[PDB]
Amino acid sequence: QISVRGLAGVENVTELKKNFNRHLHFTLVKDRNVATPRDYYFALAHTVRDHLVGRWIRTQQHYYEKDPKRIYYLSLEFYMGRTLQNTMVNLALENACDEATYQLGLDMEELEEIEEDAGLGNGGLGRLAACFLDSMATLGLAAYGYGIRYEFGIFNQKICGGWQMEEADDWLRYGNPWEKARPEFTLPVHFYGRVEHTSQGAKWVDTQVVLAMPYDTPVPGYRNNVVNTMRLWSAKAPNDFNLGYIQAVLDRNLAENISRVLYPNDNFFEGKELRLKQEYFVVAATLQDIIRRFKSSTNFDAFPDKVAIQLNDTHPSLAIPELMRVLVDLERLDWDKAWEVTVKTCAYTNHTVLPEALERWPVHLLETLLPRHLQIIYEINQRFLNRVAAAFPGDVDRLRRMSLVEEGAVKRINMAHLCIAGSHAVNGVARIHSEILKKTIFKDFYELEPHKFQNKTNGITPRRWLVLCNPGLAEIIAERIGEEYISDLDQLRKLLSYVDDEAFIRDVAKVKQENKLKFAAYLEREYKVHINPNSLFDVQVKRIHEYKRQLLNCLHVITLYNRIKKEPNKFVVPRTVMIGGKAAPGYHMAKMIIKLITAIGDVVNHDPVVGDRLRVIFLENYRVSLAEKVIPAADLSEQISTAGTEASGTGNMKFMLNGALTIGTMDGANVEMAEEAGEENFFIFGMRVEDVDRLDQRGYNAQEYYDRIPELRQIIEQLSSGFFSPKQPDLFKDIVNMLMHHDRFKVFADYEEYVKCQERVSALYKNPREWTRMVIRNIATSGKFSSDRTIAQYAREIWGVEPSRQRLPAP
Numbered sequence: 001q002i003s004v005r006g007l008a009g010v011e012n013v014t015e016l017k018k019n020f021n022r023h024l025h026f027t028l029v030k031d032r033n034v035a036t037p038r039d040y041y042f043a044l045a046h047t048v049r050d051h052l053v054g055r056w057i058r059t060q061q062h063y064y065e066k067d068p069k070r071i072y073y074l075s076l077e078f079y080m081g082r083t084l085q086n087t088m089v090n091l092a093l094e095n096a097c098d099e100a101t102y103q104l105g106l107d108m109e110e111l112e113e114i115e116e117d118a119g120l121g122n123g124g125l126g127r128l129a130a131c132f133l134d135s136m137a138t139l140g141l142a143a144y145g146y147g148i149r150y151e152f153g154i155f156n157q158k159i160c161g162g163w164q165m166e167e168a169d170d171w172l173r174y175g176n177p178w179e180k181a182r183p184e185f186t187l188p189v190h191f192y193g194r195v196e197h198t199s200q201g202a203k204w205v206d207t208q209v210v211l212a213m214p215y216d217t218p219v220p221g222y223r224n225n226v227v228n229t230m231r232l233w234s235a236k237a238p239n240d241f242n243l244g245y246i247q248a249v250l251d252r253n254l255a256e257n258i259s260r261v262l263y264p265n266d267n268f269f270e271g272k273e274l275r276l277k278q279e280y281f282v283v284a285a286t287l288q289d290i291i292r293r294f295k296s297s298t299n300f301d302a303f304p305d306k307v308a309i310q311l312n313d314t315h316p317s318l319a320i321p322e323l324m325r326v327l328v329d330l331e332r333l334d335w336d337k338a339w340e341v342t343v344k345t346c347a348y349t350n351h352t353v354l355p356e357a358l359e360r361w362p363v364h365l366l367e368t369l370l371p372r373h374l375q376i377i378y379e380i381n382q383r384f385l386n387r388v389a390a391a392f393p394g395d396v397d398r399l400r401r402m403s404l405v406e407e408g409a410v411k412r413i414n415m416a417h418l419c420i421a422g423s424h425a426v427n428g429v430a431r432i433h434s435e436i437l438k439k440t441i442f443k444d445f446y447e448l449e450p451h452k453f454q455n456k457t458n459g460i461t462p463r464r465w466l467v468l469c470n471p472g473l474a475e476i477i478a479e480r481i482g483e484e485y486i487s488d489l490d491q492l493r494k495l496l497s498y499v500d501d502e503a504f505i506r507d508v509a510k511v512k513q514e515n516k517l518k519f520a521a522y523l524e525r526e527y528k529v530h531i532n533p534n535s536l537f538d539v540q541v542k543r544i545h546e547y548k549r550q551l552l553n554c555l556h557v558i559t560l561y562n563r564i565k566k567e568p569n570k571f572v573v574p575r576t577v578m579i580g581g582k583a584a585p586g587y588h589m590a591k592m593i594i595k596l597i598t599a600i601g602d603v604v605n606h607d608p609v610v611g612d613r614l615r616v617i618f619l620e621n622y623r624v625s626l627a628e629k630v631i632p633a634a635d636l637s638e639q640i641s642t643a644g645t646e647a648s649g650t651g652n653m654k655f656m657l658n659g660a661l662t663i664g665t666m667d668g669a670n671v672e673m674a675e676e677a678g679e680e681n682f683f684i685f686g687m688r689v690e691d692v693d694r695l696d697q698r699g700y701n702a703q704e705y706y707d708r709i710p711e712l713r714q715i716i717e718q719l720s721s722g723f724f725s726p727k728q729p730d731l732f733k734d735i736v737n738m739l740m741h742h743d744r745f746k747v748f749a750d751y752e753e754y755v756k757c758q759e760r761v762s763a764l765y766k767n768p769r770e771w772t773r774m775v776i777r778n779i780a781t782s783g784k785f786s787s788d789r790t791i792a793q794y795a796r797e798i799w800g801v802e803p804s805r806q807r808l809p810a811p
């Protein structure tokens with residue numbers, strides 16, 4: 001149908017049709033008289049999967065023969081979403097399968113909608129890991145993603161009476177056709193026990209054993225016949241475990257609970273034992289796998305030439321002392337050699353500077369769970385602080401600031417300090433964030449070892465986030481500049497030469513409007529909500545946090561409503577304001593914010609004087625598959641975190657690529673995006689990082705803003721008095737009290753400038769042609785924010801390997 005989706009050759013279509021029928025009969029054990037759409041989805045998935053495995057087997061065979069340097073990307077989260085369409089796109093099968101299914105009397109888009117999201121992440125960190133696997137395969141790197149196969153991913157969000165309710169995401173219920181269980185490569189992991197010192201060195205004994213069973217998922221590159229592996233571990237009890245009889249069998253659940261459920265905290269540290277077990281479990285199983293593979297290719301001097309381990313945040317930081325434990329206690333390397341190998345192997349990516357996200361584990365937990373690792377950590381710390389003492393003699397304060405051991409009521413290990421000490425490279429995820437690391441939180445470490453500190457600005461994959469979710473936009477671009485941009489996103493710069501082309505302007509605007517109509521229809525169908533598709537689609541989708549300032553959006557929404565009520569017959573640009581995202585189950589303030597948004601909705605959406613000029617919708621159950629629908633439909637992207645708090649963001653980049661303009665602060669990657677597009681083509685507002693520091697020095701007093709801005713005062717008086725909660729007048733007192741007395745994120749300080757910036761947005765939207773021209777300028781400069789660029793930089797500057805766009809042999 002459209003050229004970017006590949007060829008529908010008669011031979012191929014014919015062969016897909018017979019394999020589809022073969023799987024329905026032999027695999028699913030159904031006939032067409034009893035088959036549901038779900039059976040048809042599974043028949044298709046198995047048909048597509050068969051095309052992967054030939055390339056999968058020869059990719060891994062190729063790596064065995066050529067023995068390249070291997071990249072191990074360790075993460076506790078991989079937020080994969082759906083796999084079917086991605087696989088078709090990457091294999092050039094999408095049109096062929098569409099035709100094949102059409103000829104069987106089936107609508108492929110309907111079958112795509114049956115697939116569950118693999119929701120094994122919380123938000124940005126997990127999604128980024130998935131983006132990265134796609135780019136690593138596309139760039140021909142011998143890369144492996146290693147994580148945990150959680151039985152339950154991020155919870156499904158239900159809204160009941162305006163309140164978030166959680167339910168278990170039972171994503172494996174119908175089976176996962178993409179994974180292959182590999183029970184033959186099951187490995188033991190140890191916990192508890194104690195350390196004995198012999199003349200033969202330390203021995204870790206009397207441990208409890210949990211088994212790690214791997215499940216492999218294929219990760220295909222974009223049209224290059226490379227298929228890499230994501231290996232996810234599942235926890236199994238050994239068969240002698242607890243072995244009255246019945247209770248011993250049932251107690252197997254204790255061990256298997258390790259892989260049961262993803263911790264639902266985005267950017268927040270909860271020091272629970274089960275979480276620590278998950279962290280060690282992934283690390284210990286992964287490292288044995290790495291070492292096995294290395295030995296099949298005494299001399300660990302070559303280990304860093306053959307292995308790179310990338311730590312995604314501090315969650316797998318125990319890789320450092322585990323690698324030392326294996327090298328020293330089991331392989332009998334001397335400490336200094338082992339440490340050299342470790343440092344050259346490991347690299348650490350930091351994802352946030354917020355203190356509540358920092359992992360600081362109590363010593364007593366490590367003492368009980370991982371007694372050998374604690375000893376190793378103490379030894380690492382002592383040798384590290386000896387180096388600090390020699391470099392800065394007499395600076396005793398530096399010694400306690402830099403220590404891996406934090407003193408206090410409870411002693412803790414700072415895992416970020418551990419990662420810096422044991423890694424040859426430490427990076428932030430956007431220029432401003434990487435600079436913040438060197439200036440503030442890791443300043444001491446930067447002074448000791450400046451060479452370690454890098455930047456690697458994040459990116460997103462143009463496969464999932466353009467071709468897959470916005471085929472219309474991909475096509476009209478391909479018409480003008482061809483298809484090479486899909487794996488070389490800088491080629492979008494060629495679109496600058498079409499900024500005055502009247503046909504292009506019209507096509508860009510038509511794609512947006514088609515996307516908006518499709519999404520408006522989706523809203524009616526699944527959620528009984530009727531919206532104006534000629535309104536500006538103003539969207540804020542991301543996890544609910546105080547730092548992301550969904551509350552600032554709320555204050556703007558209420559300002560618009562109040563302004564309409566004051567002058568009802570004045571023209572205003574119509575808006576549909578959409579806000580979506582999950583709150584962590586125990587994050588009470590985030591849950592109150594969700595309730596506020598729905599409460600504003602209840603008032604605004606049923607006020608006849610407003611009509612269809614303002615609508616406020618809370619998008620329920622925001623997840624990767626919902627992102628793929630709403631982002632192509634957006635006009636305005638809300639990226640309004642307090643300056644200095646959002647390390648990078650990736651959502652911001654997705655919107656930029658899909659033809660939305662951005663309203664935001666000079667935070668995270670917004671800075672580099674505005675720099676690429678030109679500040680004239682971005683709606684920047686609010687305090688810079690430096691203004692926030694100055695406000696902190698003087699002391700933030702929110703009452704000042706309340707006293708001098710009458711529009712703000714009116715909103716606070718509405719919230720306090722029960723305007724948005726008549727049955728429960730005091731319902732929002734915690735929100736008001738936070739805003740007035742304890743606001744770490746300075747919502748009121750950016751209110752005036754935000755409101756004025758929003759007026760400029762409205763002004764521009766009234767002139768469709770100039771709106772669309774500015775959109776073209778954003779899309780055309782979004783090339784830097786490809787994850788292919790990011791990964792090429794990791795490969796060259798950290799891992800020491802060369803990317804490649806060269807095909808491997810088909811079929």
Ligand SMILES: *Cc1c(COP(=O)(O)O)cnc(C)c1O
Nearest residue numbers: 123124542623624627649650651
């Ligand atoms: C991209 C994405 C995120 C990250 O969005 P930010 O705005 O950068 O926080 C979170 N969740 C999902 C489902 C995504 O696709």
Ligand SMILES: O=C(O)c1cc(O)c(O)c(O)c1
Nearest residue numbers: 264265266267268584586587
């Ligand atoms: O501020 C909090 O108490 C908080 C913040 C979070 O981001 C979170 O996931 C949580 O469970 C609690």
